[PDB]
Amino acid sequence: RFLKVKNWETDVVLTDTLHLKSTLETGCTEHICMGSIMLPTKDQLFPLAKEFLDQYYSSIKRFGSKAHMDRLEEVNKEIESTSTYQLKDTELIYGAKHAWRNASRCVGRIQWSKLQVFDARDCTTAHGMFNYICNHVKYATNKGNLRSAITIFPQRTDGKHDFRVWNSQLIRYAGYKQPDGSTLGDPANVQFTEICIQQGWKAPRGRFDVLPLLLQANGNDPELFQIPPELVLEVPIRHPKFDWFKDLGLKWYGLPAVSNMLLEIGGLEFSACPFSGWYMGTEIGVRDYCDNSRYNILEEVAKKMDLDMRKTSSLWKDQALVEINIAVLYSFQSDKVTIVDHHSATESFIKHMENEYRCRGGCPADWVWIVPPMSGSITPVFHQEMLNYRLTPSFEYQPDPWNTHVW
Amino acid sequence: RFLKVKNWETDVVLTDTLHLKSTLETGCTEHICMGSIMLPVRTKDQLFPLAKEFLDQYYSSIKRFGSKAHMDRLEEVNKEIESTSTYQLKDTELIYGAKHAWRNASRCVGRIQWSKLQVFDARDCTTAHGMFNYICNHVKYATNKGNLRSAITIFPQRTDGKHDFRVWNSQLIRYAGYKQPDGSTLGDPANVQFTEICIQQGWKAPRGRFDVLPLLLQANGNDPELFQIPPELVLEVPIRHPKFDWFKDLGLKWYGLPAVSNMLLEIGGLEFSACPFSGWYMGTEIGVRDYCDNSRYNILEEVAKKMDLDMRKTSSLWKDQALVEINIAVLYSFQSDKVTIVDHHSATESFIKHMENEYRCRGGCPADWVWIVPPMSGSITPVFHQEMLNYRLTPSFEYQPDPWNTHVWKG
Numbered sequence: 001r002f003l004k005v006k007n008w009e010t011d012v013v014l015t016d017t018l019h020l021k022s023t024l025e026t027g028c029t030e031h032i033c034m035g036s037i038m039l040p041t042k043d044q045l046f047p048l049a050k051e052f053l054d055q056y057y058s059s060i061k062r063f064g065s066k067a068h069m070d071r072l073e074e075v076n077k078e079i080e081s082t083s084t085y086q087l088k089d090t091e092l093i094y095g096a097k098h099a100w101r102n103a104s105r106c107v108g109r110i111q112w113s114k115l116q117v118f119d120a121r122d123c124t125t126a127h128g129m130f131n132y133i134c135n136h137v138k139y140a141t142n143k144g145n146l147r148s149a150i151t152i153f154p155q156r157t158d159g160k161h162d163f164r165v166w167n168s169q170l171i172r173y174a175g176y177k178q179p180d181g182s183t184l185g186d187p188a189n190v191q192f193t194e195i196c197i198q199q200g201w202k203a204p205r206g207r208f209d210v211l212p213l214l215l216q217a218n219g220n221d222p223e224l225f226q227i228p229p230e231l232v233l234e235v236p237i238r239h240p241k242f243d244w245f246k247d248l249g250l251k252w253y254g255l256p257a258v259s260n261m262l263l264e265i266g267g268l269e270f271s272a273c274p275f276s277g278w279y280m281g282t283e284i285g286v287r288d289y290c291d292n293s294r295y296n297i298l299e300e301v302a303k304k305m306d307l308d309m310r311k312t313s314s315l316w317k318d319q320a321l322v323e324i325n326i327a328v329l330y331s332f333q334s335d336k337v338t339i340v341d342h343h344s345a346t347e348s349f350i351k352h353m354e355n356e357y358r359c360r361g362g363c364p365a366d367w368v369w370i371v372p373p374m375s376g377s378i379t380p381v382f383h384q385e386m387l388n389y390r391l392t393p394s395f396e397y398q399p400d401p402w403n404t405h406v407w
Numbered sequence: 408r409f410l411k412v413k414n415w416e417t418d419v420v421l422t423d424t425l426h427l428k429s430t431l432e433t434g435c436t437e438h439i440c441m442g443s444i445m446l447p448v449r450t451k452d453q454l455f456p457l458a459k460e461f462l463d464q465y466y467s468s469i470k471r472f473g474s475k476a477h478m479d480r481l482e483e484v485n486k487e488i489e490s491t492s493t494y495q496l497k498d499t500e501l502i503y504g505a506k507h508a509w510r511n512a513s514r515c516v517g518r519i520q521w522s523k524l525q526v527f528d529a530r531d532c533t534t535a536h537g538m539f540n541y542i543c544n545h546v547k548y549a550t551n552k553g554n555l556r557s558a559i560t561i562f563p564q565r566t567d568g569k570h571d572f573r574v575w576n577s578q579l580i581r582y583a584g585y586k587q588p589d590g591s592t593l594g595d596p597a598n599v600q601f602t603e604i605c606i607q608q609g610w611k612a613p614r615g616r617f618d619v620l621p622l623l624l625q626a627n628g629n630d631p632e633l634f635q636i637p638p639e640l641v642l643e644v645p646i647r648h649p650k651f652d653w654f655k656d657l658g659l660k661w662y663g664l665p666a667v668s669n670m671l672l673e674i675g676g677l678e679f680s681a682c683p684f685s686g687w688y689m690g691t692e693i694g695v696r697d698y699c700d701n702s703r704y705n706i707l708e709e710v711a712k713k714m715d716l717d718m719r720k721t722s723s724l725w726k727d728q729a730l731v732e733i734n735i736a737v738l739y740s741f742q743s744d745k746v747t748i749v750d751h752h753s754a755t756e757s758f759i760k761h762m763e764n765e766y767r768c769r770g771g772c773p774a775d776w777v778w779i780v781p782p783m784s785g786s787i788t789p790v791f792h793q794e795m796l797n798y799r800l801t802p803s804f805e806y807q808p809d810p811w812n813t814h815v816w817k818g
């Protein structure tokens with residue numbers, strides 16, 4: 001009921017009391033831990049509404065006030081009548097900021113209160129969606145000086161009028177299977193690229209083709225739109241000491257913008273809610289460049305470095321991995337595009353977590369994701385025990401729309 | 408029930424049925440996952456089912472389930488429990504149990520080797536002097552002049568909890584740590600408390616950076632006694648780097664035999680509180696944890712200085728660069744001196760092959776991702792993208808409290 005977490009580097013011990021407000025399931029049981037599994041009605045809605053409105057009213061120091069009670073009744077009334085309800089703007093901004101606050105897999109949550117929420121609940125068409133998105137992209141990008149944002153489209157109704165961004169991120173590179181058997185571009189986006197072509201996109205068939213947006217308004221069939229190239233800030237990748245690095249032909253985009261998740265606030269479901277921040281360097285240099293199912297360039301970089309690749313024990317993979325990550329950071333910094341390295345991001349997070357422990361009573365965190373995908377042990381999060389539990393408002397996974405949408 | 412795990416690199420999906428045999432708890436609930444928490448006398452009543460469980464597994468493994476030998480063994484154990492409150496394992500059962508506790512060790516990446524464990528039965532041991540002899544023998548055998556062999560030594564089981572055998576050392580071989588008055592630490596900061604006990608017990612500390620600790624050994628619940636391991640039995644490797652000639656002048660060395668001696672072995676409900684076991688090192692345990700943890704030798708700054716990296720900002724990745732160089736050094740030194748060691752790529756690759764084979768033949772392989780993923784370069788190893796299920800099978804190794812915390816002193 002009071003839970004202790006220890007830091008094995010500093011001996012510091014912290015007490016979590018926030019977990020007693022956990023609600024959704026973890027996937028784990030007393031018999032089996034699923035901590036490393038990536039995906040482990042009117043009657044239903046009012047409790048969720050109440051739970052949310054109670055936390056909102058508590059947060060502005062107005063708990064049990066007539067204004068609190070009157071909103072509970074109003075929402076109760078509207079649920080009884082319409083089977084759903086509408087959030088006040090203040091509630092929407094609170095709910096969104098808190099869904100980020102509660103994202104146990106996010107190392108960047110120190111920034112959670114500074115989120116810019118764009119309310120797009122008046123949107124009715126895919127063209128309208130496209131406009132809201134370009135606006136979000138321009139605002140978030142800010143000529144390289146990135147600002148966090150989320151844009152919130154209309155909430156689910158019957159579940160057959162869903163708004164969805166079919167892209168998994170607003171900005172991402174196409175993937176194509178070649179007669180050769182190999183893959184050109186990003187292998188992660190092969191499927192989504194084919195649907196784009198099936199829908200009518202003229203693919204440039206290159207290595208770094210920014211995908212078009214495929215947008216679904218009001219449950220209608222989704223539509224293609226090209227983001228104005230001038231709004232997609234990209235960074236060519238060079239290394240501060242290896243001149244040959246640039247020749248590998250590498251570049252990436254400055255804006256990480258997740259667009260396939262669902263935002264849940266007070267039982268209400270926001271199926272299109274793209275949100276963006278800025279990159280931690282390892283996301284591009286370790287995952288995007290170096291996963292075997294991604295650009296997979298470790299081999300080619302190690303070769304240009306003339307490392308000995310005869311035996312794994314030379315740590316050639318590791319040497320190359322560092323230099324690739326050095327080059328990413330260097331390139332973003334030289335072009336004045338916001339980026340954070342994993343030492344700085346995790347130090348910031350440990351500061352955030354201690355802040356949350358004193359002020360909120362805990363900070364749900366998923367160690368498997370919070371510890372960076374390289375040099376884990378030499379970052380201050382490795383030795384930090386974490387408790388992982390689900391608080392609402394939250395971001396949730398949802399299935400890809402092509403598996404569900406009826407044409 | 409069937410449980411699926413996926414590999415996000417290869418899309419290979421595996422099905423777990425072995426979790427149905429799980430017992431003890433994880434610490435987790437449907438409301439809270441404690442997957443990253445490091446640590447979240449038995450009655451006749453609880454003992455016979457534990458024994459039966461174990462002997463059913465044992466007789467299955469040998470294709471003799473339900474046999475006359477099986478049933479006679481259940482009955483023989485049952486009555487021994489009735490009349491003595493405990494029972495004795497056959498040697499065959501002990502070997503099987505120990506091998507399985509390793510096979511079931513969800514935090515161990517080295518499990519491909521589980522079936523080749525040399526088991527030394529020390530249940531006839533009665534004194535600390537006897538323990539010391541058993542341990543020197545274990546060390547000499549396991550070390551094998553640098554061609555390392557896995558081994559475990561098993562001392563008598565717990566009886567009433569007042570007569571425990573305990574190795575007070577957390578590992579058989581480890582370096583002393585000394586807190587200086589100015590607040591610095593000489594040698595290994597992990598062993599300061601234990602070093603202090605040793606000294607209090609009469610150990611004459613050399614007070615150097617790499618002093619091999621004496622063994623502190625408790626037999627039959629008696630006060631523990633000090634013994635120095637013969638230096639000729641302690642294999643050590645001077646650490647140097649294949650390209651950087653100044654690396655040797657850091658004065659680093661490490662011991663070749665990792666030998667955990669503070670855990671408890673549970674088999675068939677019996678508790679073996681002194682069961683030191685050893686294998687060989689994965690390079691990162693020395694180069695990442697032992698050398699570069701801030702609470703350990705903490706040499707990252709010194710190495711980076713000598714390399715003349717840009718240390719003005721974390722974003723040059725100077726710490727990562729030095730980390731890789733130190734780990735390169737450790738593996739190069741070990742290989743050159745022909746002392747068994749495994750790099751993290753080869754170890755995790757072997758583990759994945761082990762794990763898949765365990766799914767085919769056993770219906771699962773419980774694994775703790777937090778420990779299985781190496782402490783550097785996680786994502787470029789094949790375990791990072793591997794979903795794992797963590798649950799507890801017996802026989803097992805368990806944590807137990809440090810003995811200076813519970814021991815009743817006799818004087």
Ligand code: HEM
Nearest residue numbers: 100103105106107108111148275276277278279280369395
């Ligand atoms: C401001 C800069 C931000 C940074 C540096 C950052 C960092 C990260 C990282 C590194 C991960 C996954 C671990 C990895 O990729 O290695 C992640 C996950 C996540 N973040 Fe952030 N984040 C930022 C902003 C945001 C914002 C603005 C939101 C929402 C408003 C958000 C919500 C999430 C969620 C829901 C996940 C989990 C995604 C999933 O389960 O797939 N983050 N974050």
Ligand code: HEM
Nearest residue numbers: 509512514515516517520557684685686687688689778804
């Ligand atoms: C043969 C070579 C072996 C290798 C390379 C190896 C490797 C490792 C590593 C790397 C870890 C923890 C992860 C880390 O420290 O970064 C570990 C943990 C562990 N291994 Fe092994 N292992 C070996 C042999 C053994 C043997 C012989 C046993 C027992 C019979 C054993 C049982 C365990 C246990 C119980 C843990 C968890 C320790 C704890 O919770 O503190 N391993 N192993």
Ligand SMILES: Cc1cc(N)nc(CCc2cc(N)cc(CCc3cc(C)cc(N)n3)c2)c1
Nearest residue numbers: 038256258275276277278279280368369415792
């Ligand atoms: C808003 C925001 C900003 C920012 N800078 N970064 C993000 C996360 C984006 C992200 C995108 C993808 N495709 C995969 C992962 C990790 C996928 C993963 C992680 C682990 C630990 C294991 C595994 N199998 N997969 C993270 C969001």
Ligand SMILES: Cc1cc(N)nc(CCc2cc(N)cc(CCc3cc(C)cc(N)n3)c2)c1
Nearest residue numbers: 008383445665667684685686687688689777778
């Ligand atoms: C028999 C054997 C052979 C072999 N090569 N290695 C071992 C494991 C030895 C070991 C010893 C210590 N002191 C700490 C750890 C990990 C400590 C740790 C890991 C993680 C993931 C987090 C954390 N806080 N602490 C492991 C046993």
Ligand SMILES: [Cl-]
Nearest residue numbers: 256283284288
């Ligand atoms: Cl990405």
Ligand SMILES: [Cl-]
Nearest residue numbers: 287291415792
């Ligand atoms: Cl990934």
Ligand SMILES: [Cl-]
Nearest residue numbers: 665692693697
């Ligand atoms: Cl160690």
Ligand SMILES: [Cl-]
Nearest residue numbers: 008383696700
């Ligand atoms: Cl550690």
Ligand SMILES: [Zn+2]
Nearest residue numbers: 028033435440
């Ligand atoms: Zn769990």
Ligand SMILES: [Zn+2]
Nearest residue numbers: 287291786792
């Ligand atoms: Zn990856």
Ligand SMILES: [Zn+2]
Nearest residue numbers: 377383696700
């Ligand atoms: Zn450590």
